[PDB]
Design a protein around this nucleic acid. Structure first.
Ligand SMILES: [Zn+2]
Ligand SMILES: [Zn+2]
Ligand SMILES: [Zn+2]
Ligand SMILES: [Zn+2]
Lengths: 196, 89, 138, 139, 87, 203
DNA sequence: ATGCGGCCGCAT
DNA sequence: ATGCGGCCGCAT
């Protein structure tokens, strides 16, 4: 899908070289500082077929805070060079990376494909991984030790599953009722996904 | 974490927010952290040490309310602690 | 009330605080004079210390290490500690997702080692290493 | 084309190829596991001057690693650099003229990989060897 | 005191060949000939794609001494150069 | 002083001078091992009737066609001086009003031109002050004594570089010759005596 | 996050 | 020598 903030949703379409489609979405969260940022990157090709656009969008998840830049790339191919440069500069991984390694201080890529999901649908893989992370969080709350581990798992979960916390610092997942609520939320997401 | 920053200008490119005139490098400057409407993160609005007090902000105990206060030179710390009371001149 | 013996201790402590501050600033200015940025990077690298981003931070960390000793690696994450107004905060990465939150006022550190190249400037410091540890605000 | 002369010649060219592709394997492994600033740290740690240019940086790093950290010059106290056929001095014997020192057996201490890159040092499999620089035997 | 021919892997793709006038790609093999610069006191290299260099009429007998930085290349590349030198 | 003709403003403008220093310097740099032998003229011209300012750079090989120039019309009446001083200190390593003309390694050296057929050809860059010629004569003295010593060819190289810097020569595209030969030192000493006689002739 | 100016290696 | 593009610290 073409992002509407570019204005070319009609005049153009999303590009795809092979199996990879040039339309990635990354997120980055840090509860200690309150950071919770989203980054959309798209490479759009005209329906005519030979004008090319690099569309960057960034900001705070589910909030007005953010911005975007639409750079009309002159060359039909250097647009891809710029796309890959930005991807590897933001996430620390190559574009066609077999493995989505997480690099410190850098973003993490989300697998996409109305308000409960601020950034859109989610693949069953991400939701399965989030459910397993919630499993680990529940077991660690039963252990009742290492709040730093709770912080780590909370960051991972809030990265895989975006939430609209506004301008408020995301809450830690030390409480058991919170883990149960988020597990019920993930079950709702799973039912909504299987409905499709 | 704090709400107020103070430091010697790491470059003269920054411009004051009241008089809109460029700040000189290695000069004392005070900033207030505000949400950046363009990205997720706080950003400092900078001010000449003289202009900062004319915008209506007042600080009670600079030694804890301001960031990097302990990093300044001593007589500058005392100048800040003095201007905190009253203002300006 | 009490403001004769207690107040005396308070004044003495603030005097020592001023002493340490203007001492470190004299050191910073002398380094600004007799050395270039790359020489300070050499200095930091020699003491196993990480090289920061920014001239100000570079010479600040150099002065810190010189006066109080070369900060050793972190306890858990093996990162690097940095002074931050009130205490030494760790700037390492305990994991690819979260920052390390270590924080102390008495970090582990070996004695600083000025390379012999700047012996010509080392005597410009008059040694004066002193057994003084970092003095923090009340 | 004597057989004794020719056997020795082939042996020497074999050793030459060995050294070349060895140093190139090392250079590529460094290109992989390290950044430019890490290599500058490495050079600074061994008292070596930091050149201008990524290629030159990793070249000098590989040189120092395989054969040892080149010591300062004999007269001018500058820094020596490999130059295809031998080590040329790049110091300044005076403010007007370049130092012209030139040798094939410079003085050098043993290289010292910092422990930070021990994770990559084992990637070199040690294999330091007592091998000195092999030069072309043309003239 | 210096040679007449240089060879190296492109330290950047900004340089452009002198025959085809098409940009040289970075980290690719390229050969240059040193010539006097009519704009300042000093020699400057005219660069060439390794394939174009031989079509300009220059021929080298013994590359191992006639060319600069020959020993710095990769071995199979040294042998490719030594082979193309002939014919 | 004099306006360089390659700028084309010799009529429309004049050479500037702030105080005792005149903004019209000439530097040279020589290295016999590599054959380097370069000249660099730097002038700051002010319009003869107005407030237009020009920064004129010229550089190249001594007494040869190899070289070039750039005439940059500076907009500000004063930033031209900032640019002039920046270029001077970037090329020679010394400040503009330096009490001492220190020689920095790999950098140029400033020559003292006599602002105010032999001169047309024998001196490629123009007249020379008696100070430079005295220093060159002393360097030739040292070269003669070192040739009598017959040792340290690196010292001969150093003195040769210093001399060829202080006294420009039109060697074309050829590497300047070392001053190891005694007859060469005698010839250059006779040349310097000729220069001294030509200078004293001017009264 | 990006914009932008100073800086430095590589071309010419 | 300068021109120019990539890079990185400092502003916003
Ligand atoms: Zn102001
Ligand atoms: Zn830590
Ligand atoms: Zn030397
Ligand atoms: Zn070509």
């Amino acid at each position: 899908a073409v992002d509407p903030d570019s204005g070319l949703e009609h005049s153009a379409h999303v590009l795809e070289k092979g199996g990879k489609v040039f339309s990635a979405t990354l997120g980055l969260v840090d509860i200690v500082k309150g950071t919770n940022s989203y980054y959309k990157l798209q490479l759009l090709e005209d329906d005519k077929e030979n004008r090319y656009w690099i569309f960057r969008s960034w900001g705070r998840v589910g909030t007005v805070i953010g911005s975007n830049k639409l750079e009309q790339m002159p060359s039909k191919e250097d647009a891809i060079e710029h796309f890959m440069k930005l991807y590897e500069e933001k996430t620390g991984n190559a574009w066609h990376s077999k493995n989505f390694t997480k690099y410190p201080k850098k973003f993490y890529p989300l697998e996409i494909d109305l308000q409960k999901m601020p950034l859109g649908k989610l693949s069953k893989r991400q939701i399965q991984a989030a459910y397993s992370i919630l499993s680990e969080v529940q077991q660690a709350v039963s252990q009742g030790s290492s709040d730093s581990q709770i912080l780590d798992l909370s960051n991972r979960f809030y990265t895989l599953i975006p939430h609209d916390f506004g301008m408020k610092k995301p809450p830690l997942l030390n409480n058991a009722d919170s883990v149960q609520a988020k597990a019920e939320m993930l079950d709702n997401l799973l039912d909504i996904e299987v409905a499709y | 974490d704090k709400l107020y920053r103070v430091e010697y200008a790491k470059s003269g490119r920054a411009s004051c927010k009241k008089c809109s005139e460029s700040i000189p490098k290695d000069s004392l400057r005070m900033a207030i952290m505000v949400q950046s409407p363009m990205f997720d993160g706080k950003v400092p609005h900078w001010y000449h040490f003289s202009c900062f007090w004319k915008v209506g902000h007042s600080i009670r105990h600079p030694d804890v309310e301001v960031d990097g206060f302990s990093e300044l030179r001593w007589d500058d710390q005392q100048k800040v602690k003095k201007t905190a009371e009253a203002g300006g001149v | 009330k009490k403001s004769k013996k207690e107040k005396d201790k308070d004044s003495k402590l603030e005097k020592a605080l001023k002493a340490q501050n203007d001492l470190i600033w004299n050191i910073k200015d002398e380094l600004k004079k007799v050395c270039s940025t790359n020489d300070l990077k050499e200095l930091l690298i020699f003491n196993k210390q990480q090289v920061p981003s920014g001239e100000s931070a570079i010479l600040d960390r150099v002065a810190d290490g010189m006066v109080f000793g070369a900060l050793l690696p972190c306890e858990e994450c093996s990162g690097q500690l940095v002074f931050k107004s009130d205490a030494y905060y760790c700037t390492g990465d305990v994991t690819a997702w979260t920052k390390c939150m270590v924080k102390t006022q008495t970090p582990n550190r070996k004695e600083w080692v000025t390379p012999k190249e700047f012996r010509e400037i080392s005597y410009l410091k008059k040694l004066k290493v002193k057994k003084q540890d970092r003095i923090f605000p009340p």
